[PDB]
Every structure is written in C-alpha cells, then in structure tokens.
Amino acid sequence: EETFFGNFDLASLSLWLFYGFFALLIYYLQTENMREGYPLEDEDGNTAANQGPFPLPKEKTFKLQHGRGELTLPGEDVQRRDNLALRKTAHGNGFPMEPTGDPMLDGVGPASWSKRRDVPELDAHGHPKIVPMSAAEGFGVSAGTDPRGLPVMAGDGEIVGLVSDMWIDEAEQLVRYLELELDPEWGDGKRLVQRQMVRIKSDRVKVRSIYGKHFKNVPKTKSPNQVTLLEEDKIMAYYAGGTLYADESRLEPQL
Amino acid sequence: CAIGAFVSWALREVEICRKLGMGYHVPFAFSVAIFAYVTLVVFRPLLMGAWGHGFPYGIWSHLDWVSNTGYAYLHFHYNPAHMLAVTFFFTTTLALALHGALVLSAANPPKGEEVKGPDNEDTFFRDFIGYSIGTLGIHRVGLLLALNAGFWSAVCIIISGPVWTKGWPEWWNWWLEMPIWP
Amino acid sequence: GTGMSVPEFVSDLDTPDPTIEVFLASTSDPVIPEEGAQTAGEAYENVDPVLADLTVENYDRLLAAMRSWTGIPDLLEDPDHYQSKVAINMIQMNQTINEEWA
Amino acid sequence: PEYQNIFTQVQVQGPAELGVDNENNLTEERTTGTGFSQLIGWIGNAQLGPIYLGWFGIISLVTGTLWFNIVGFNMLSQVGYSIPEFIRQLFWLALEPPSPEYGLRMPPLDDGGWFIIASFFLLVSVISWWLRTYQLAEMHKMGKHVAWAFAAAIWLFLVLGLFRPILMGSWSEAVPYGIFPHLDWTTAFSIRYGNLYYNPFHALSIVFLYGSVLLFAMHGATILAVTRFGGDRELEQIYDRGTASERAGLFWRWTMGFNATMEGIHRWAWWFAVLTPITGGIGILLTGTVVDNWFLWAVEHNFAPDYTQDYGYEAYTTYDGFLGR
Amino acid sequence: SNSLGRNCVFCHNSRAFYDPAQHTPQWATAMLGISMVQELNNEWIVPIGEAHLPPERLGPVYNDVPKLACKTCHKGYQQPLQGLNVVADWPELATTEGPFYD
Numbered sequence: 001e002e003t004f005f006g007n008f009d010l011a012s013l014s015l016w017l018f019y020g021f022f023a024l025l026i027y028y029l030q031t032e033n034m035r036e037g038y039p040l041e042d043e044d045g046n047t048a049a050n051q052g053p054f055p056l057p058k059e060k061t062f063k064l065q066h067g068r069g070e071l072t073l074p075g076e077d078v079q080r081r082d083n084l085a086l087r088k089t090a091h092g093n094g095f096p097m098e099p100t101g102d103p104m105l106d107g108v109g110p111a112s113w114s115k116r117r118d119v120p121e122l123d124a125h126g127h128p129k130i131v132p133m134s135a136a137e138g139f140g141v142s143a144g145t146d147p148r149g150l151p152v153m154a155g156d157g158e159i160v161g162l163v164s165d166m167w168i169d170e171a172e173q174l175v176r177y178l179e180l181e182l183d184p185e186w187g188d189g190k191r192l193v194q195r196q197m198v199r200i201k202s203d204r205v206k207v208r209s210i211y212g213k214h215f216k217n218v219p220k221t222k223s224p225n226q227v228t229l230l231e232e233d234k235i236m237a238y239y240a241g242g243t244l245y246a247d248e249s250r251l252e253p254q255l
Numbered sequence: 256c257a258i259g260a261f262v263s264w265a266l267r268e269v270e271i272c273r274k275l276g277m278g279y280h281v282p283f284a285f286s287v288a289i290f291a292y293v294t295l296v297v298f299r300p301l302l303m304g305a306w307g308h309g310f311p312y313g314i315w316s317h318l319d320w321v322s323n324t325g326y327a328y329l330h331f332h333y334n335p336a337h338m339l340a341v342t343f344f345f346t347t348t349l350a351l352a353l354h355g356a357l358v359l360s361a362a363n364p365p366k367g368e369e370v371k372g373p374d375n376e377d378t379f380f381r382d383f384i385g386y387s388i389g390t391l392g393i394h395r396v397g398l399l400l401a402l403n404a405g406f407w408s409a410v411c412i413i414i415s416g417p418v419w420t421k422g423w424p425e426w427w428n429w430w431l432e433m434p435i436w437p
Numbered sequence: 438g439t440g441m442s443v444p445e446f447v448s449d450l451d452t453p454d455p456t457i458e459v460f461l462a463s464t465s466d467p468v469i470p471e472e473g474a475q476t477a478g479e480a481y482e483n484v485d486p487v488l489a490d491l492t493v494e495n496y497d498r499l500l501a502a503m504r505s506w507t508g509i510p511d512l513l514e515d516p517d518h519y520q521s522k523v524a525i526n527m528i529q530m531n532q533t534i535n536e537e538w539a
Numbered sequence: 540p541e542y543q544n545i546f547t548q549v550q551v552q553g554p555a556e557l558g559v560d561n562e563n564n565l566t567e568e569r570t571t572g573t574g575f576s577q578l579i580g581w582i583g584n585a586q587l588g589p590i591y592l593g594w595f596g597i598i599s600l601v602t603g604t605l606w607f608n609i610v611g612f613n614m615l616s617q618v619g620y621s622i623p624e625f626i627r628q629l630f631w632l633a634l635e636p637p638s639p640e641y642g643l644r645m646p647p648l649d650d651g652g653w654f655i656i657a658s659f660f661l662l663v664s665v666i667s668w669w670l671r672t673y674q675l676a677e678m679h680k681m682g683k684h685v686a687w688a689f690a691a692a693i694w695l696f697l698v699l700g701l702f703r704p705i706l707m708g709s710w711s712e713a714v715p716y717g718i719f720p721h722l723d724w725t726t727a728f729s730i731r732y733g734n735l736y737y738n739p740f741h742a743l744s745i746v747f748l749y750g751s752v753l754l755f756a757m758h759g760a761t762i763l764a765v766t767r768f769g770g771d772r773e774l775e776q777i778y779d780r781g782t783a784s785e786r787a788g789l790f791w792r793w794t795m796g797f798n799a800t801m802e803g804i805h806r807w808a809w810w811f812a813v814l815t816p817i818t819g820g821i822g823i824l825l826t827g828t829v830v831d832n833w834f835l836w837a838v839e840h841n842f843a844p845d846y847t848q849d850y851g852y853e854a855y856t857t858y859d860g861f862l863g864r
Numbered sequence: 865s866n867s868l869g870r871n872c873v874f875c876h877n878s879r880a881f882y883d884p885a886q887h888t889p890q891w892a893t894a895m896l897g898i899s900m901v902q903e904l905n906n907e908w909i910v911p912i913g914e915a916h917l918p919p920e921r922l923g924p925v926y927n928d929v930p931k932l933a934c935k936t937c938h939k940g941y942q943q944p945l946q947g948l949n950v951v952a953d954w955p956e957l958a959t960t961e962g963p964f965y966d
C-alpha cells in the first residue's frame with residue numbers, strides 16, 4: 001500500500017479520527033454527569049469563584065407515572081435541608097464541621113437524611129410497593145429461618161423486644177423491613193429495621209449499630225400499613241448514624 | 256514505593272468509608288488487584304529464586320515480557336486456568352453491557368412516553384430469555400465475576416513457573432490416556 | 438527484563454542421562470599400530486571397509502562396540518544377512534557424519 | 540461482623556408474576572407455566588419462566604440447531620462413527636474452512652461445502668435473534684439500547700467471518716469450528732502478520748476491556764455498600780434523589796476528585812463495553828489489507844524499544860554450570 | 865522444542881520471529897541441523913532398507929521405510945548424551961580415509 005505523505009497510510013488516518021472522536025465522547029460523558037449538585041459553593045453557603053473547566057449541560061425532561069408531573073434537570077435543589085445544627089471549626093475552607101447538639105437526633109453527619117417526597121413508592125398497579133406480611137395474599141416463608149417471634153438483641157447486649165412482623169416487596173418478592181415490638185422498659189410502640197442491618201440466628205436477632213437506649217428514638221411511621229420515602233430515609237439514616245455516634249470509642253482514633 | 260502507595264490508597268479508602276457510614280466493599284475489591292500485582296512482582300520471583308523474573312516498567316517493553324513468558328510454555332492457550340480467567344473476563348464485559356443497556360432503556364423511553372419501573376425490566380428479561388436475576392442480584396453477580404477474573408489470573412500466572420515446567424499441551428495427556436478408553 | 442529464560446526442576450537437573458553409564462562400560466582405548474602389523478584382511482574373509490584395519494582394532498571394534506551398541510550378538514557373521522549389508526553402509530554413513538558435518 | 544448482603548438470610552414466595560401488558564397484547568404469545576428454584580434464590584430471583592414465542596425466536600432456534608447438528612455430524616463422521624473415540628477426541632476435532640486454492644468459489648462438500656452451509660445457517664440465526672431483541676423493546680415501549688450494544692458485538696463477529704474474507708478474496712480466511720482448533724487459529728493469525736501487540740487498535744481494545752472489568756468491580760462494590768440506604772432501587776433514585784446517591788457520589792469525589800450521578804454511571808459503563816468490539820473490528824479489518832507486519836510498522840513509526848545486551852545462554856552462564864557438574 | 869527439551873525463547877526473541885539480529889547463537893546450529901537431517905534421510909537412510917529390510921519394519925500405512933529426525937539422536941536432551949565425548953576412543957569412525965592413530 002502507498003502513503004499520502006511520509007509514513008501516512010489508512011491506519012494513521014483512522015487512528016487520528018478515533019482520537020478526535022474520543023475527545024468529543026469524553027466531553028459529552030463528563031457533561032452528562034453534572035445534572036445534580038451544581039453550581040458549587042464555598043463552606044459559608046455562597047457561590048464559589050471557581051466553577052471548573054466544563055460548562056453546565058442543557059435541560060432534559062422526564063415524564064413520571066401515576067400523574068406525578070415532570071422533572072427538569074439541572075434545576076433548583078428541591079432535596080435541600082433548611083436548618084442544620086452544625087458549626088464551623090475554622091475561618092477558612094477545608095476543615096470539618098462540629099455538631100451543635102445531638103447528631104443522631106438532628107440528622108447530621110452519617111445520620112443525614114435527604115428530603116424526599118412524602119408519598120410511598122408505587123408498583124405497576126398503582127398500589128404501595130412495600131406492604132406488611134399480614135396483608136399480603138398468598139405469601140409465606142419458603143427457605144431460611146423464620147425470624148417472627150424471636151427476641152431482638154441490641155449492640156451493647158440488651159434484649160429490647162420481639163419481632164412481630166415482616167414488611168415485604170410484593171413485586172420483587174423480597175423482604176425489606178423487620179418490625180419490632182418494644183418492651184415497656186425500652187420504649188413504647190413498634191419500630192422498623194432495614195433487612196440489611198440485622199443477622200438472623202437460630203434463637204435471636206442481632207442489631208449491632210445502635211445500643212439499647214437508642215431504640216426509643218427511632219423515627220416512627222405515620223400509618224401502620226405504609227411508609228413514605230421521607231420516613232424511610234429518616235429511619236435508615238438513624239440506624240446508620242450509630243456506627244459512629246453510638247459510643248465515644250467508635251469516633252476517636254482506633255490506632 | 257509502589258507497594259507502599261497501593262496499600263496507603265486502600266487504607267485511605269477504608270477511612271473515607273468509615274467517615275461516610277458505608278460498607279467496606281470497595282477496599283476489599285481493590286485488594287484483589289493489589290494481590291494480582293504482588294503475585295506478579297513478589298511471589299513468583301520469590302518462588303523462582305530471582306528478582307529478575309518480574310516485568311519491566313515501560314509502556315511498550317512490558318508487552319515483550321508477556322510475549323516471551325507466554326511462549327516459554329509453548330502454547331499458552333492450553334493452560335486451563337488461563338481458559339477460566341479469559342471466560343470470566345468475557346462474561347463480565349457482556350454482563351456490564353447488558354446491565355447498562357437495561358437501566359438506560361428504562362430511564363430513557365422514546366420521545367413522548369412515560370418512564371418505566373423495575374416491573375418493566377423484569378418483564379423484558381423474562382420475555383427475552385425466560386429468566387431475570389433482579390436489581391439486587393445483578394450487582395452481586397457483577398462483583399463476583401470481576402473478583403473471580405482477578406483471582407484466576409493470579410492463579411494462572413503462579414502455576415506456570417514454579418509448579419509446571421514442560422509445555423502446556425502435554426498436560427492433557429492425563430485425559431488422552433485414561434484406562435477407560437479402549 | 439525481556440522474559441527470555443528456561444525453567445527446570447532442580448531434582449531433574451541432578452539426574453543424568455541413564456544411558457551415559459552404559460557407554461562407559463563398553464568402550465576401550467585404541468591400540469597404536471606397530472611396524473608392519475598383520476591386518477584383518479589377511480586373517481579372515483571380510484569386506485573392504487574394515488579390511489585394512491589392524492587385527493586388535495578389528496576385535497575391539499567388531500564385538501566390543503558394534504555387537505553391544507546395537508543388540509545383535511551375531512552381527513556381521515554371515516555376509517549374506519541383510520543386517521550385515523545394512524551395517525556396512527551404516528559404517529560409511531557414520532564416517533560421513535563425523536567428517537563432513539563437523 | 541456486620542451483614543455484608545451477599546446471600547439472602549430468608550426467602551419468601553408468593554403467586555407467580557406473569558408480567559405487564561399493554562395494547563400490544565404481549566400475553567397472546569407467552570407460555571403458561573412457571574417454576575421456583577430455591578438454590579438460585581439465595582443470590583437472586585427464584586422464579587423461572589415464562590418466555591415469549593415469536594417468529595424470530597423460532598427461526599433463530601431452528602437455524603442454530605441446524606448449525607450445531609451439521610458441525611457435530613461432520614465431526615462424528617470424521618472419526619468413523621465410533622462414539623468412544625468421538626468422546627475421547629472431542630476437544631481436538633473441528634469443521635475446517637476451505638482450502639486457499641478455491642478463492643471465493645463454491646468448494647466441494649469434501650473440502651468446505653458443509654462449512655459454507657453451516658456458516659449460512661449460523662448467520663441467519665444470529666440476525667434473527669437481533670431482530671427479536673429489537674422487536675421486544677419496540678413492543679414494550681422502551682429504548683433500544685440493548686439492540687445497539689448487541690450490534691456492536693455483531694460487528695466484530697461479521698468482520699471476523701464475512702467482511703475480511705471477502706476483502707482478501709478467499710473463504711479460507713475464516714475461523715474453524717472447534718475448541719482447540721480456534722485457539723490455534725488465534726495464535727497462528729498473530730504470528731503470521733508480525734506481532735499483534737504492536738497493532739494500536741488491539742491495544743485500544745485491551746484498554747477498553749480492562750476498563751470495563753474495572754468499572755464493573757467499582758460499580759458492584761459501590762452499590763452493595765450503599766444498599767443499607769436502599770441503593771439497589773436505582774430508578775427511583777434517578778427520579779427522586781436520596782441519601783444513597785449522595786453518599787455514593789461523595790465517596791468517589793473524596794477519593795479521586797470527581798464523581799458521577801446515579802444515571803450517568805450507566806452511560807460510562809455502556810460506552811466502555813461497546814467500545815471494545817468496535818476498536819477490535821477496526822484493528823482486525825486493517826490487518827493484511829493495509830499492514831502486513833506490525834513490528835516493522837512500529838519500527839517505522841518509532842515506538843519499538845531497543846535492547847543493548849546480548850542474546851544466547853553463553854553470555855550469561857555455562858552448560859556445566861546449569862547442570863551443576 | 866520437544867526434541868531438545870527446551871522452549872521457544874531458546875533460539876528466539878518471540879516479538880520478532882523473522883529478524884536475524886534478534887536470534888541467539890543456537891539458531892545457526894539448528895539451521896545446519898535441518899540440512900544435515902535432509903541429507904541423511906534422502907541419501908543414506910531411505911535408499912537402504914528399501915533394498916534389504918523385511919516386511920515387518922514398514923509401518924501401518926504406505927508401507928514406509930523408517931526415517932530419522934532430531935530426537936533420534938538428541939532423545940530429549942540439549943546435547944546427545946549431554947555432551948559426552950564418544951569419538952576420541954574410535955578414530956575409525958571419524959574419517960572416510962585411513963584411520964589416524966596419532
């Protein structure tokens with residue numbers, strides 16, 4: 001084969017064309033990923049003087065099901081929190097924040113929740129997606145150990161109550177939450193725990209993230225038959241905040 | 256220096272995970288790549304008896320090492336562990352393509368149409384092939400496939416020098432000469 | 438750094454070729470010819486390639502070497518056997534290998 | 540330790556899910572009958588079936604079965620119809636492409652005709668399967684991403700078997716149908732045209748394959764680590780952002796200085812996987828038709844390394860020294 | 865490779881199998897051996913045996929006279945008998961002309 005000039009043949013031309021295409025593709029991919037969380041701010045809440053090398057993308061629109069309307073991004077941050085019990089530890093940028101009161105009750109740090117919609121998630125029929133097992137037709141335990149009736153163990157080794165029900169996902173056939181009935185010495189009412197923070201044994205259920213005295217302050221649901229997205233975010237954030245805030249030794253250096 | 260840097264990177268990831276309140280899956284997954292690198296530069300030269308068995312640090316010169324090491328066992332495609340590792344690599348790539356495609360197709364319908372949900376995805380794959388793994392099983396399967404790819408790559412390289420010395424086609428003589436054949 | 442090397446098991450490197458000791462148990466030193474020594478042609482009826490050898494060399498080559506290196510105990514006894522005719526050519530082939538392919 | 544969410548602790552089972560429908564009436568062609576497997580329920584869904592039966596699926600099944608049977612019966616006849624010897628040599632047999640002397644003409648059945656018939660049936664089967672995957676997404680009122688990513692692999696498939704042999708002018712350039720015999724073709728192809736390492740498109744293909752495996756490891760680990768916040772429900776996180784997405788983004792932002800969104804990570808994944816066969820096919824199509832020795836090409840373009848030391852064992856050791864005498 | 869008990873990087877830098885400047889010194893000896901084997905097969909071994917050998921030495925198909933190759937002498941070692949000197953004791957097999965017992 002012949003060369004146009006020097007060593008330039010078809011392979012070199014293909015290589016250079018691919019280089020140009022890949023540059024354009026990298027630009028597109030980076031731009032598509034800036035639809036949430038922009039523009040940037042400083043630690044005092046004001047818009048930062050620096051905004052980056054890549055400009056912001058144009059707007060796209062989603063059409064939601066069950067008559068919830070439209071969503072256009074990028075836009076205003078509707079999931080933003082209003083009053084945070086946090087304090088600055090330096091006059092400049094780049095340093096941590098310090099909780100003002102109780103981080104577990106105020107929802108800061110690893111205990112943070114996002115402000116989602118106050119409605120339950122639906123399935124294709126238009127019904128609430130997550131339902132207690134007592135109101136699911138034809139469902140039952142098919143394998144593994146049934147946890148209903150077993151006692152619940154706290155992270156410090158205290159028995160706080162018993163498992164009274166399970167909340168399952170009918171469309172996907174999976175268990176999402178475990179419902180507990182608290183003893184009078186450890187609070188009143190019922191609480192939910194996500195299935196991803198428990199270990200089911202032959203005689204007990206173990207929850208290691210929070211202690212016995214933390215179980216009365218778990219956020220509660222408004223209704224006994226459904227849970228909204230906000231409530232779920234608030235409940236799971238509470239359980240995850242204990243991995244750092246339950247004990248003073250969990251926060252200080254381990255060495 | 257490189258070993259120190261890689262271990263420091265993993266421990267920094269652990270500290271970030273702890274501060275954010277997450278699980279430690281990402282540092283554990285990175286540990287397997289670290290293990291493959293350490294097998295390439297530490298364990299195999301140690302078993303073979305010389306530091307000179309490691310690959311050089313050059314963009315185009317570390318391919319010559321792979322070529323010459325592959326041709327020192329004659330036909331390297333006949334290594335069974337290499338076969339397993341190659342299969343895992345191909346399957347991981349296919350699964351990633353399918354997963355990305357399904358999620359994008361759910362979130363981005365044709366113009367003028369409402370978005371879809373997990374029920375729709377489950378229905379597309381049961382219609383397509385008769386089984387659906389679910390939105391939680393696909394992530395487990397992808398992680399397991401990638402980790403298996405790394406582990407079997409390490410095994411395949413570590414058996415070539417210190418455990419087997421002849422050519423790799425000769426290994427199948429156990430199958431070719433079983434007593435059960437006439 | 439190029440990866441060009443040959444691996445071998447250490448225990449295999451210490452096991453020699455088992456046929457080396459067999460050759461050393463069947464070889465002997467040559468005998469320097471004397472002045473006007475009797476040849477093999479004048480004592481028997483043999484073929485020309487091995488006819489001009491000495492007598493002692495003829496013994497130490499015929500039996501001590503060829504009848505043990507190939508396992509034929511009566512080799513070159515009957516001149517009409519096919520083995521004798523093949524061996525006569527093989528002597529010349531060996532000489533050619535040692536001379537023209539050094 | 541804490542639960543890691545790799546195997547499910549307890550399983551529940553209800554009525555079988557027959558699937559959604561619309562005016563397109565998908566229920567008409569669906570089979571009736573489902574099963575449950577408790578062994579695969581530890582890792583994913585337990586339900587098996589049902590399936591969709593169309594014209595494209597049936598055509599693809601029949602043609603693929605025909606291709607398989609032609610290859611198998613040729614392999615069986617090549618050994619004398621001896622079943623024990625057919626089993627003994629299964630990995631070494633193949634159905635071989637025609638000889639180079641026939642060009643693009645039709646060869647005899649003894650020397651490649653069966654190969655051509657089997658290739659035609661396999662091509663029909665694969666194209667019919669692609670048509671089925673397009674039609675299902677059209678009837679479900681979804682996007683066409685699955686079909687486009689299957690078409691990217693079909694591109695390398697077609698380049699390997701159809702386009703390059705036509706460009707070179709011989710059916711003898713195709714790949715034999717066998718296990719050890721196709722791995723022999725791979726090695727011989729690499730040796731014949733120099734060194735395939737020094738093909739820049741082979742290097743780009745390796746880049747994208749490595750990157751796709753790395754990306755799947757990262758994404759799987761990240762989603763499993765935020766599942767305690769309901770992170771595996773990705774679509775609802777796209778429609779209504781929650782704390783799982785924020786934590787997942789902030790991890791990688793604090794690690795390497797930039798991050799993605801819940802929807803944008805799948806675009807990255809889709810492109811890295813699809814770019815592998817495209818660059819691979821471009822590289823394969825350029826070999827033999829444009830470049831005939833890739834190492835000499837690298838020498839010409841000045842990216843082949845140079846070595847100073849000597850060759851041979853006598854420059855480093857001694858034969859007696861290696862043997863230990 | 866199976867005849868000498870070595871691998872490919874013995875005699876070759878596999879990044880360029882064609883290049884004469886990337887070969888080792890054992891590649892020239894192999895090149896000489898190819899011609900030597902061709903000559904031995906076509907001039908000495910095949911022509912005899914076709915005239916004397918009995919039918920029980922002719923092989924399954926084609927009824928062929930046996931032939932030799934690399935492994936007939938090397939037998940899986942880098943050198944035949946690992947380099948033993950076998951010609952110093954036998955001057956009669958070293959040259960075509962009269963033996964030199966000097």
Ligand code: BCL
Binds near residue numbers: 325407408
């Ligand atoms: C003649 C050549 C032989 C051959 C010789 C070999 C040899 C020899 C080897 C393999 C190896 C492999 N072969 Mg093979 N192989 C051949 C042909 C093939 C073919 C094919 C024909 O299609 C395929 C698909 C493969 C593929 C493979 C994989 C199974 C495997 C790759 C290792 C890996 O991914 O570990 C991935 C893991 C790593 C090593 C990555 C480590 C990453 C580290 C921890 C992070 C570094 C950070 C970095 C510095 C940061 C920079 C960025 C910053 C901005 C600075 N082989 C041919 C036939 N093959 C290799 C293997 O398995 O080794 C383990 C190997 O050594």
Ligand code: BCL
Binds near residue numbers: 332342346349722
């Ligand atoms: C890319 C360069 C070479 C090539 C490089 C390699 C290398 C290198 C290897 C494979 C290996 C395999 N190759 Mg090949 N192979 C190529 C192209 C193909 C094509 C094709 C384009 O039609 C097919 C059907 C196959 C298929 C196969 C299987 C025989 C085997 C398993 C790997 C695999 O698919 O895992 C990925 C799996 C998926 C993506 C999907 C999983 C679905 C099933 C498993 C598909 C397999 C097909 C089936 C086994 C083929 C018929 C076999 C009979 C039923 C007995 N190869 C190209 C031409 N091939 C491996 C091997 O031989 O291991 C023993 C191996 O190491």
Ligand code: BCL
Binds near residue numbers: 295315743747753
């Ligand atoms: C894995 C088994 C073999 C191997 C087989 C191959 C083969 C075969 C190929 C590569 C190729 C590459 N190899 Mg190598 N390579 C090996 C081990 C390594 C190691 C290591 C463990 O330290 C590194 C860092 C590399 C790096 C590289 C890149 C230079 C290149 C692109 C692949 C890639 O990273 O994309 C995957 C990962 C990403 C997409 C993440 C991005 C990482 C970037 C691109 C890499 C930066 C490396 C940098 C230039 C070197 C270090 C700089 C220091 C900071 C000073 N190789 C081992 C020995 N390597 C390809 C090549 O040469 O292309 C031209 C190629 O064809």
Ligand code: BCL
Binds near residue numbers: 726744745820
């Ligand atoms: C000695 C061997 C040569 C070599 C020879 C080749 C050759 C030859 C080729 C590769 C190719 C590839 N090489 Mg290379 N390669 C070498 C060494 C390596 C090494 C290494 C040493 O580390 C690596 C990592 C690789 C890696 C790769 C891949 C990146 C690439 C394959 C693309 C792909 O997506 O495959 C995935 C495979 C496919 C998608 C094939 C198509 C599959 C279709 C879709 C199957 C249809 C379905 C089927 C028919 C039906 C099944 C029935 C079921 C039961 C239902 N090579 C050495 C240098 N390499 C290929 C390439 O693209 O090169 C540019 C190629 O052709």
Ligand SMILES: CC[C@H]1c2cc3[nH]c4c(c3C)C(=O)[C@H](C(=O)OC)c4c3nc(cc4[nH]c(cc(n2)[C@@H]1C)c(C(C)=O)c4C)[C@@H](C)[C@@H]3CCC(=O)OC/C=C(\C)CCC[C@H](C)CCC[C@H](C)CCCC(C)C
Binds near residue numbers: 260287311317405760
């Ligand atoms: C099966 C496991 C797969 C995997 C997983 C994996 N990799 C990972 C992770 C995970 C889960 C991370 O979390 C981590 C990350 O942060 O990714 C963004 C990472 C990572 N894997 C990376 C790369 C990488 N992964 C690879 C492969 C894989 N990664 C596997 C396929 C490969 C190859 C060759 O296929 C590469 C190149 C990095 C982008 C990143 C971590 C790198 C890092 O930050 O290292 C810290 C150190 C530095 C900043 C630079 C150190 C420089 C040295 C001191 C000098 C150079 C030495 C080197 C040996 C020279 C090499 C020269 C070459 C020419 C050979």
Ligand SMILES: CC[C@H]1c2cc3[nH]c4c(c3C)C(=O)[C@H](C(=O)OC)c4c3nc(cc4[nH]c(cc(n2)[C@@H]1C)c(C(C)=O)c4C)[C@@H](C)[C@@H]3CCC(=O)OC/C=C(\C)CCC[C@H](C)CCC[C@H](C)CCCC(C)C
Binds near residue numbers: 385573575576600603
């Ligand atoms: C890796 C992806 C490939 C793939 C795989 C695949 N096919 C599958 C499955 C999977 C993972 C199933 O789970 C499902 C099945 O039931 O397998 C036993 C199936 C199936 N899809 C099929 C068609 C099919 N899909 C195809 C495509 C593909 N699917 C991809 C190439 C093709 C090809 C290659 O063109 C065909 C021919 C059959 C192989 C099988 C038929 C299933 C069916 O008709 O309906 C669902 C099942 C029932 C009728 C009820 C249960 C009876 C089962 C058929 C047997 C197993 C029952 C047992 C009690 C459980 C044991 C565990 C099982 C996992 C084996």
Ligand SMILES: CC[C@H]1c2cc3[nH]c4c(c3C)C(=O)[C@H](C(=O)OC)c4c3nc(cc4[nH]c(cc(n2)[C@@H]1C)c(C(C)=O)c4C)[C@@H](C)[C@@H]3CCC(=O)OC/C=C(\C)CCC[C@H](C)CCC[C@H](C)CCCC(C)C
Binds near residue numbers: 349685813
């Ligand atoms: C982006 C590139 C990657 C990729 C992508 C990719 N592959 C794909 C897709 C995508 C996006 C599909 O949508 C499609 C699919 O169906 O996925 C489930 C597919 C697919 N990729 C496949 C194979 C494949 N992909 C490969 C590679 C890759 N795929 C790349 C890594 C490879 C290799 C070598 O690495 C292979 C071997 C198939 C599983 C499937 C295409 C199915 C197809 O076309 O089938 C045609 C039908 C036949 C030939 C009939 C066969 C008849 C059989 C003899 C019996 C009947 C089938 C039965 C179910 C099998 C036997 C079961 C036993 C229990 C009896």
Ligand SMILES: COC1=C(OC)C(=O)C(C/C=C(\C)CC/C=C(\C)CC/C=C(\C)CC/C=C(\C)CC/C=C(\C)CC/C=C(\C)CC/C=C(/C)CC/C=C(\C)CC/C=C(\C)CCC=C(C)C)=C(C)C1=O
Binds near residue numbers: 784794
């Ligand atoms: C759903 O969920 C998910 C997400 O979310 C939504 C995600 O997003 C992601 C993430 C995925 C993507 C974003 C897709 C794209 C990803 C890839 C293609 C992967 C490959 C990645 C790369 C090629 C890039 C990786 C880059 C690396 C590793 C280099 C970055 C590192 C550095 C620059 C150094 C780090 C800095 C350190 C250690 C601190 C500095 C040290 C000090 C002591 C501070 C003191 C200061 C100084 C000494 C001087 C000042 C220092 C400076 C300025 C630092 C910079 C350095 C310089 C030299 C200038 C996934 C998977 C996910 O599933």
Ligand SMILES: COC(C)(C)C(=O)C/C=C(\C)CC/C=C(\C)CC/C=C(\C)CCCC/C(C)=C\CCC(C)CC/C=C(\C)CCC=C(C)C
Binds near residue numbers: 659
């Ligand atoms: C006899 O026993 C029974 C009945 C049980 C059997 O049936 C047994 C069967 C077997 C044991 C079968 C075994 C089969 C294999 C091991 C098969 C292996 C096959 C491969 C590895 C195939 C690879 C194929 C292709 C590759 C690598 C690349 C590209 C190919 C193509 C693009 C093919 C397409 C061809 C075309 C378009 C040419 C068509 C020509 C025209 C003129 C239209």
Ligand SMILES: [Fe+3]
Binds near residue numbers: 354358758762773
């Ligand atoms: Fe995902």
